[PDB]
Design an enzyme around this catalytic site. Sequence first.
Site, PDB file in Angstrom:
ATOM      1  N   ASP A 144       0.779  -1.237   0.000  1.00  0.00           N
ATOM      2  CA  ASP A 144       0.000   0.000   0.000  1.00  0.00           C
ATOM      3  C   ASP A 144       0.836   1.327   0.000  1.00  0.00           C
ATOM      4  O   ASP A 144       0.388   2.333  -0.580  1.00  0.00           O
ATOM      5  CB  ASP A 144      -0.897   0.061   1.226  1.00  0.00           C
ATOM      6  CG  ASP A 144      -2.054  -0.912   1.159  1.00  0.00           C
ATOM      7  OD1 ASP A 144      -2.554  -1.269   0.048  1.00  0.00           O
ATOM      8  OD2 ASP A 144      -2.520  -1.365   2.200  1.00  0.00           O
ATOM      9  N   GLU A 153     -11.556   6.340   5.415  1.00  0.00           N
ATOM     10  CA  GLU A 153     -11.869   6.377   3.984  1.00  0.00           C
ATOM     11  C   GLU A 153     -13.296   6.841   3.670  1.00  0.00           C
ATOM     12  O   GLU A 153     -14.098   6.166   2.981  1.00  0.00           O
ATOM     13  CB  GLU A 153     -11.596   4.980   3.332  1.00  0.00           C
ATOM     14  CG  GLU A 153     -10.129   4.492   3.440  1.00  0.00           C
ATOM     15  CD  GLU A 153      -9.943   3.068   2.933  1.00  0.00           C
ATOM     16  OE1 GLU A 153     -10.928   2.292   2.934  1.00  0.00           O
ATOM     17  OE2 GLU A 153      -8.815   2.707   2.506  1.00  0.00           O
ATOM     18  N   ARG A 171     -15.866   3.829   6.646  1.00  0.00           N
ATOM     19  CA  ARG A 171     -15.460   2.467   6.939  1.00  0.00           C
ATOM     20  C   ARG A 171     -14.983   2.418   8.393  1.00  0.00           C
ATOM     21  O   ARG A 171     -13.996   3.083   8.757  1.00  0.00           O
ATOM     22  CB  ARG A 171     -14.322   2.096   6.014  1.00  0.00           C
ATOM     23  CG  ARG A 171     -13.610   0.809   6.311  1.00  0.00           C
ATOM     24  CD  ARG A 171     -12.305   0.722   5.423  1.00  0.00           C
ATOM     25  NE  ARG A 171     -11.413  -0.419   5.732  1.00  0.00           N
ATOM     26  CZ  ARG A 171     -10.403  -0.829   4.946  1.00  0.00           C
ATOM     27  NH1 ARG A 171     -10.192  -0.246   3.749  1.00  0.00           N
ATOM     28  NH2 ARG A 171      -9.668  -1.896   5.310  1.00  0.00           N
ATOM     29  N   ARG A 231     -14.228  -9.068  -1.505  1.00  0.00           N
ATOM     30  CA  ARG A 231     -14.435  -8.020  -2.458  1.00  0.00           C
ATOM     31  C   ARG A 231     -14.787  -8.577  -3.815  1.00  0.00           C
ATOM     32  O   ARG A 231     -14.017  -8.417  -4.765  1.00  0.00           O
ATOM     33  CB  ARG A 231     -13.220  -7.077  -2.539  1.00  0.00           C
ATOM     34  CG  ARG A 231     -12.869  -6.455  -1.187  1.00  0.00           C
ATOM     35  CD  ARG A 231     -11.467  -5.892  -1.105  1.00  0.00           C
ATOM     36  NE  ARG A 231     -11.344  -5.147   0.161  1.00  0.00           N
ATOM     37  CZ  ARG A 231     -10.296  -4.390   0.505  1.00  0.00           C
ATOM     38  NH1 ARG A 231      -9.245  -4.298  -0.332  1.00  0.00           N
ATOM     39  NH2 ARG A 231     -10.304  -3.730   1.679  1.00  0.00           N
ATOM     40  N   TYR A 258     -12.876  -1.142  -3.718  1.00  0.00           N
ATOM     41  CA  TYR A 258     -13.390   0.094  -3.108  1.00  0.00           C
ATOM     42  C   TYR A 258     -14.536   0.637  -3.947  1.00  0.00           C
ATOM     43  O   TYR A 258     -14.672   0.316  -5.137  1.00  0.00           O
ATOM     44  CB  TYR A 258     -12.278   1.126  -3.068  1.00  0.00           C
ATOM     45  CG  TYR A 258     -11.332   0.976  -1.884  1.00  0.00           C
ATOM     46  CD1 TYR A 258     -11.223  -0.251  -1.173  1.00  0.00           C
ATOM     47  CD2 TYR A 258     -10.479   2.025  -1.536  1.00  0.00           C
ATOM     48  CE1 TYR A 258     -10.329  -0.361  -0.069  1.00  0.00           C
ATOM     49  CE2 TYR A 258      -9.651   1.926  -0.443  1.00  0.00           C
ATOM     50  CZ  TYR A 258      -9.567   0.729   0.270  1.00  0.00           C
ATOM     51  OH  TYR A 258      -8.721   0.687   1.336  1.00  0.00           O
TER      52      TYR A 258
HETATM   53  C1  LIG Z   1      -3.065   4.475   3.798  1.00  0.00           C
HETATM   54  C2  LIG Z   1      -3.305   3.023   3.507  1.00  0.00           C
HETATM   55  O1  LIG Z   1      -2.409   2.197   3.546  1.00  0.00           O
HETATM   56  N1  LIG Z   1      -4.557   2.695   3.204  1.00  0.00           N
HETATM   57  C3  LIG Z   1      -4.920   1.319   2.900  1.00  0.00           C
HETATM   58  C4  LIG Z   1      -6.157   1.041   3.748  1.00  0.00           C
HETATM   59  C5  LIG Z   1      -5.772   0.620   5.161  1.00  0.00           C
HETATM   60  O2  LIG Z   1      -4.973  -0.568   5.106  1.00  0.00           O
HETATM   61  C6  LIG Z   1      -7.010   0.360   6.011  1.00  0.00           C
HETATM   62  O3  LIG Z   1      -7.935   1.441   5.848  1.00  0.00           O
HETATM   63  C7  LIG Z   1      -6.642   0.222   7.483  1.00  0.00           C
HETATM   64  O4  LIG Z   1      -6.277   1.504   8.006  1.00  0.00           O
HETATM   65  O5  LIG Z   1      -6.962   0.025   3.148  1.00  0.00           O
HETATM   66  C8  LIG Z   1      -6.222  -0.815   2.263  1.00  0.00           C
HETATM   67  O6  LIG Z   1      -5.030  -1.267   2.915  1.00  0.00           O
HETATM   68  C9  LIG Z   1      -7.065  -2.003   1.875  1.00  0.00           C
HETATM   69  O7  LIG Z   1      -7.861  -2.470   2.717  1.00  0.00           O
HETATM   70  O8  LIG Z   1      -6.936  -2.475   0.724  1.00  0.00           O
HETATM   71  C10 LIG Z   1      -5.850  -0.025   1.015  1.00  0.00           C
HETATM   72  C11 LIG Z   1      -5.255   1.318   1.414  1.00  0.00           C
HETATM   73  O9  LIG Z   1      -4.064   1.556   0.655  1.00  0.00           O
END
Ligand SMILES: CC(=O)N[C@H]1[C@H]([C@H](O)[C@H](O)CO)O[C@@](O)(C(=O)O)C[C@@H]1O
Lengths: 389, 389, 389, 389
Positions: free
Chosen positions: D70, D197, D212, D291, D325
């Site tokens: 991520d 988010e 969420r 998903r 998403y």
């Molecule tokens: C900043 C960041 O890493 N955001 C990531 C968030 C967090 O992991 C969750 O919201 C937990 O905080 O969700 C994802 O990981 C996911 O679920 O696919 C994608 C996204 O890139």
Amino acid sequence: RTFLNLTKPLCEVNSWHILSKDNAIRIGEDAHILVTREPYLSCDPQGCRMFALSQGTTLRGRHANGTIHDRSPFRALISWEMGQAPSPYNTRVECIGWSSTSCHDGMSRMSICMSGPNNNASAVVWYGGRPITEIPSWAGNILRTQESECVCHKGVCPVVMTDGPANNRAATKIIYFKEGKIQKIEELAGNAQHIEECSCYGAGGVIKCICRDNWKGANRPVITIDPEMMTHTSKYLCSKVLTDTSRPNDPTNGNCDAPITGGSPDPGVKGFAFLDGENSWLGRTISKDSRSGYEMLKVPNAETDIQSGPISNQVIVNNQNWSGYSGAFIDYWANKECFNPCFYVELIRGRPKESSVLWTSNSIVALCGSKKRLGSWSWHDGAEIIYFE
Amino acid sequence: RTFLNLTKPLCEVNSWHILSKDNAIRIGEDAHILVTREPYLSCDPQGCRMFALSQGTTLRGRHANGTIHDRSPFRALISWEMGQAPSPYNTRVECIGWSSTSCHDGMSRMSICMSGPNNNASAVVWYGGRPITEIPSWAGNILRTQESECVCHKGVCPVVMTDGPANNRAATKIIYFKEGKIQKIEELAGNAQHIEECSCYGAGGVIKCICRDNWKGANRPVITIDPEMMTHTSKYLCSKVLTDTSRPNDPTNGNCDAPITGGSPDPGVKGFAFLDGENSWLGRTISKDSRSGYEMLKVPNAETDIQSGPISNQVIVNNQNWSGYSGAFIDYWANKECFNPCFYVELIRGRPKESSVLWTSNSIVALCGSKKRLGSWSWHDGAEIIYFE
Amino acid sequence: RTFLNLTKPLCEVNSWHILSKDNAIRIGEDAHILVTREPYLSCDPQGCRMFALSQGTTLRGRHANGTIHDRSPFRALISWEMGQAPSPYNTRVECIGWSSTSCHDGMSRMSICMSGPNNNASAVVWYGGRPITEIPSWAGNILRTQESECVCHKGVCPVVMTDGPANNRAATKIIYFKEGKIQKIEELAGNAQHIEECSCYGAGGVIKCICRDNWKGANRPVITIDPEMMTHTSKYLCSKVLTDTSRPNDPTNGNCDAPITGGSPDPGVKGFAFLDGENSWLGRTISKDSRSGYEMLKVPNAETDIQSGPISNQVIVNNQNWSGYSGAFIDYWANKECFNPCFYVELIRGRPKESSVLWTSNSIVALCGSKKRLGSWSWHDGAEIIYFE
Amino acid sequence: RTFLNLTKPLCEVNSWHILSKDNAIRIGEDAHILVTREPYLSCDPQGCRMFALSQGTTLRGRHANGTIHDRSPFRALISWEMGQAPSPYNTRVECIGWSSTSCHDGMSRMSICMSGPNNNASAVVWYGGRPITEIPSWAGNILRTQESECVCHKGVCPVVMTDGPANNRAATKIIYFKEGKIQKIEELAGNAQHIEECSCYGAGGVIKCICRDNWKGANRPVITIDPEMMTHTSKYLCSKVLTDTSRPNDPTNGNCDAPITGGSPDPGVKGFAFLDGENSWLGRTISKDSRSGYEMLKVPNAETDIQSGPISNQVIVNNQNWSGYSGAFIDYWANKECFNPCFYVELIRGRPKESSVLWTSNSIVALCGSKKRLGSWSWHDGAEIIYFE
Ligand SMILES: CC(=O)N[C@H]1[C@H]([C@H](O)[C@H](O)CO)O[C@@](O)(C(=O)O)C[C@@H]1O
Ligand SMILES: CC(=O)N[C@H]1[C@H]([C@H](O)[C@H](O)CO)O[C@@](O)(C(=O)O)C[C@@H]1O
Ligand SMILES: CC(=O)N[C@H]1[C@H]([C@H](O)[C@H](O)CO)O[C@@](O)(C(=O)O)C[C@@H]1O
Ligand SMILES: CC(=O)N[C@H]1[C@H]([C@H](O)[C@H](O)CO)O[C@@](O)(C(=O)O)C[C@@H]1O
Ligand SMILES: CC(=O)N[C@H]1[C@H]([C@H](O)[C@H](O)CO)O[C@@](O)(C(=O)O)C[C@@H]1O
Ligand SMILES: CC(=O)N[C@H]1[C@H]([C@H](O)[C@H](O)CO)O[C@@](O)(C(=O)O)C[C@@H]1O
Ligand SMILES: CC(=O)N[C@H]1[C@H]([C@H](O)[C@H](O)CO)O[C@@](O)(C(=O)O)C[C@@H]1O
Ligand SMILES: CC(=O)N[C@H]1[C@H]([C@H](O)[C@H](O)CO)O[C@@](O)(C(=O)O)C[C@@H]1O
Ligand SMILES: *[C@@H]1O[C@H](CO)[C@@H](O)[C@H](O)[C@H]1NC(C)=O
Ligand SMILES: [Ca+2]
Ligand SMILES: [Ca+2]
Ligand SMILES: [Ca+2]
Ligand SMILES: [Ca+2]
């Protein structure tokens, strides 16, 4: 639209925030990305652009082989929208040649490129996208210039150029342009003993160029230009915090008016500093020997105090990754009461430090000042060399 | 905007500065670059652009095979931002066909292409990017035109066209256009015995076209056009310095009114000159036999004096490299008190001279006059043919 | 600046000049070119653009496999600068779906796409780049439309749509739009027995749509639309010269009011004609069985005379080459006193006629009328299928 | 141009029409398409654009490998013309980092990205394409934000940010911006126990943010913001129809003021809903576990009644396909008396669900409301993963 006047002071800077990163080598592994080096950024009333010397080939193309070489008839200055990687499809050719500078005066953009053989180079000066003036070599030995942006005030844009040896007295000139026409030429004066690749910015009607002494000094030369009177002075940065690359350990005291020798094995690299009394920051590679790592050091009074040391620091690129040239730029047209310092770091990939490939190229990272205390991390190039083998 | 009027004299020229180079073959070895030939440049109030006849395939594509062929239903005139290489992504189609010319009258651009079978070609004349007029072949044998820019005065843009044998007397006409509509048609008159691929420029109210005599002369024909009266004369360049390709050695005296024959093995190549008394420059390939190397020779009074020889020279492409077509253009909208001469050189790569590949294409270099004495070097294509094998 | 008015008469036409050709398949063998079908052209006050239904993949991509299929969630209407080939980098998505039409009213462009399953498709009508109106299927059987441009007068743009069997009586409507809003809907009336894929053009306040009767006739249905009254009539082309594909031999007499049946093995192809008394031209495939070749035939009084035959012809694509859909467009914003007819021919490559590849795609050629007697040649696709094996 | 305000009501919605689809994975199998995730759309007076977080590498490139991850120094927020796929050649870098939001206030666009290490992240706030404000992490644990557009009223654009544990109580703030400057900061208040988010939209002068809860609830938190008083409240969606992913079966009653626990194995997913009394729609994946698939459910009084169930449904992506998403956006500048709900679905391909490849990326589909009763079909990604093996 009017001429930019350097009527504002530098913003207070306590931290550096991320502005842009193009990840060119990562993307260029599979997309059509031009090989470059000697990058920078420059702004105008509408925003900021990235600039670089293309090598006239893509990174994955077979003509990338041999691009360690600095000068050929295949190089040109190219500009593109900040943040994108430079490809044959998104890049504007500013001029043809293997050394350059460029700046916007509030009305149009001036771009300059040198080309030709070592003993017979010439500069072409462009304004608003048209060629205006040509300047032949005066010392017959690689007429060359800043490799980052120039700075304008009331229409007058001074440019630092050198012609002559890389390892001995050379003939440096300050040429003052307006709409690409020569207003005045001065020979370099003062105590700087060698000048190359000046990184310049303006503030309070004063232009300061922090340069590269490739002949003797591990400390950086500083030239102070008055763009109204069109006069200058030169000396060295006083700080004991040496910022050129391949420097010895920092000494007990710097030297304002003479070069401090030493370092191994590189004679120099392009770099920069912002000098504003207590609000002064010096960039340098973390390695004292090589172009690896990059750190910003806040060194109050580095311009005047040979005893000045760092009171804060920020790693821009960790010492496990390669850096390269670094220079200054400012978005003079920002909606702020002060001019906020920015800089970029060239992230060289390939030869000579990574000889498993045949080419030499780079990506770009750029950051600007913050009054806040911001956290940070290393903004290294990010490409895996093994993928190119 | 207003109609361009050719009110200014040619600038003085003592040497040539680099204007642009697209390094198309180097880049096209691994990026999506169109196969072209017959390139040129043409400017307008906003700047200059590059033009060429695409072959309707990319250089690396399998359809590049066979592209030595000059005429097909898959060619078109394309233009693009000066300095970029021509890709399927950044090129504008001006018109469809396999011979063209183009020029901006100060208000809009006129573009003309010929297409069709040898015995039934037609021209389509475009203005402001819309088709205006069509002209059928009058001699049923490859109706064809300049392959470089036309020139306009008070809205009147003459164009030189030819229909008829390549190796015997043919039917040349000068067609006068305004906003893409035919104002007058004249048959060729005077002492030029064969006319092709004219390279034309304007100064002091007079348009000069330096052309290719493909039938007899190694000296180039010259047509002088009065754009207001819409009349012309023709003869040959007087100089003993022969500039066509496949020419014999220069003789003791040239001939103003008759062709100087000889040379082997090719009947001709598109070329150009600027003619302005002492301020006269002739371009030619360095080889007298092949399209290799390219040199600029300053020959005072070349236009009128059969004994005129060179007083200076500047190598543009060394004789170990391939050249091609060459032609004239001028940025008539530059912020100067005189019209500065510019030219381009087509740098042909592949067949027939390099038969290790199945294609034929080119890159471009362009240069303009300077009143200074600038150093020079070779601006050869720079691609390695072995990379294409 | 203003809503277009169809006040001008059609230009006299005696032969056809080349307007554009994109050579998409040749280029797409190596460059990143999208797979398409059902192309057309449409113009606005600034110029003309090419349109088509992408298949949501490039020609060389593995997803080009299976693109003979007409309807998927991966198709969309894309437009791009006339002459370039459609790439993922230079195309604008007009709307999403697998049947479309588009036209400019003089102020802004309306674009319409149908999408969804066969028994439940829907149209979304766009204007100035924003979604305005949605229209659900009324007969639950592949709601579809023109596949070439619509025509507007005083801001009213009529569109012909069909919903219902392809091989039996169906439900056709004429929907009159203004700024993408429905002004009036009409059920098809008159003697045309089946309507598909209308190719429409305007002159002297009248809009004629020449269509495809996929149920019975090898003669084409003609819908005449009054855009001010928003009313219409329909019948067939009277001429004995049959212009649909998979037609029988032309009979002794055509039929103004009923289908002339026969032919093998396919029920229809989109086509067009220009109807103006003596100044009438009919396009058709050369082959009476398959979509190969393309010819223009001047058939005086084709719209009213059952005995009318050809007095001249122009081969556009030779019968040794594949053609496809054909349709009408006009540059209504030309600087002319008459509206000049133009048309395009879709050059289909791949399946089912060329089964050595897994895909189906096309390139485009377009031409416009000339008052002159111009020579011609075949403008076939030009790609070598073996290169795709 | 003026500041947008949110006084208009939401449009009535009875079904969803297709707005856009970029088919990025199909196309990126052979063209140069950036690896992304966390996409969305946002509009302005001129139209709408697609946004996402690039991974700084093409889909086919070797650096695609490892893109499940991520956060890295190689990500950036990019925007491009709606409907095109994101390439290195048509994308604008909005800012650098690995979490973002963006919105247009009617005058200029604000964009925000967080970057840096987990323990020391920072946000840079951009306005009109320039950096304006920086914000250091306050809880020292991955400062992060919406991953879909923010919404502006009279110059004020609220943004929801979180810093803290993903699996426990965290520190959420609402920050109110005007021209990129902080007007106010608020700690989260109300009964929502965890916020990530948020998908936000405005109507009747009120902004609702559907979020969420990654800590406990399979029901979604809702934050109501007044952009004039710059204050908010929070609670959960009342409905029994649970819309997070990894949720249990829908219970007989929802819970307005506490999280409903259960579901396996994932703690949450970004989603959205439009809450407008009877005119309320909830989106969710079809599978309660993963998903996959995507459906829209019209659930009257979902915001207030715990017994509220669906009265209609529309499948957006069938349950045999991957989703991801989903978020809300509106074209607030449409020419309508009401604001028409729009939404997108991120279509994830690759890891972890498709482990035969080394990468993770996505394509996009977007739809808007219709008052008509339109048919529908599945808008799945459409790439064949086998082609990438
Ligand atoms: C900043 C960041 O890493 N955001 C990531 C968030 C967090 O992991 C969750 O919201 C937990 O905080 O969700 C994802 O990981 C996911 O679920 O696919 C994608 C996204 O890139
Ligand atoms: C015009 C030119 O070649 N400039 C080159 C300069 C000079 O070599 C030194 O400044 C000595 O003058 O620095 C480099 O070589 C270098 O160190 O990487 C890069 C740059 O291209
Ligand atoms: C990118 C990198 O690996 N840099 C390393 C360099 C290079 O290996 C040598 O300079 C190669 O000559 O060596 C160091 O001692 C240095 O100079 O700082 C440590 C640093 O981590
Ligand atoms: C219309 C056309 O075919 N022009 C061609 C001309 C003619 O062959 C000659 O001028 C003889 O007429 O010159 C070339 O062939 C050539 O020499 O390379 C290139 C050009 O494409
Ligand atoms: C580009 C190039 O290699 N040119 C060489 C040519 C070509 O070999 C022949 O023209 C091939 O026909 O031969 C020369 O004698 C000449 O023509 O001057 C020397 C020149 O260096
Ligand atoms: C919406 C749709 O599928 N249109 C298709 C139509 C219909 O099949 C026929 O008009 C019968 O209705 O024609 C084609 O199939 C064809 O013949 O090539 C192509 C086109 O895509
Ligand atoms: C493009 C092409 O090859 N056309 C040929 C066609 C096709 O082969 C068949 O129509 C396929 O069924 O056959 C012909 O008899 C015809 O139709 O006129 C001759 C023509 O040259
Ligand atoms: C896209 C897809 O294949 N979805 C399938 C999923 C996934 O395989 C698992 O969620 C993987 O964990 O499993 C289902 O039982 C479900 O979730 O409803 C059936 C559904 O068809
Ligand atoms: C909201 O915008 C509309 C349209 O410009 C305007 O008429 C109205 O005065 C604005 N309302 C408020 C409360 O600002
Ligand atoms: Ca030094
Ligand atoms: Ca000759
Ligand atoms: Ca039929
Ligand atoms: Ca949850």
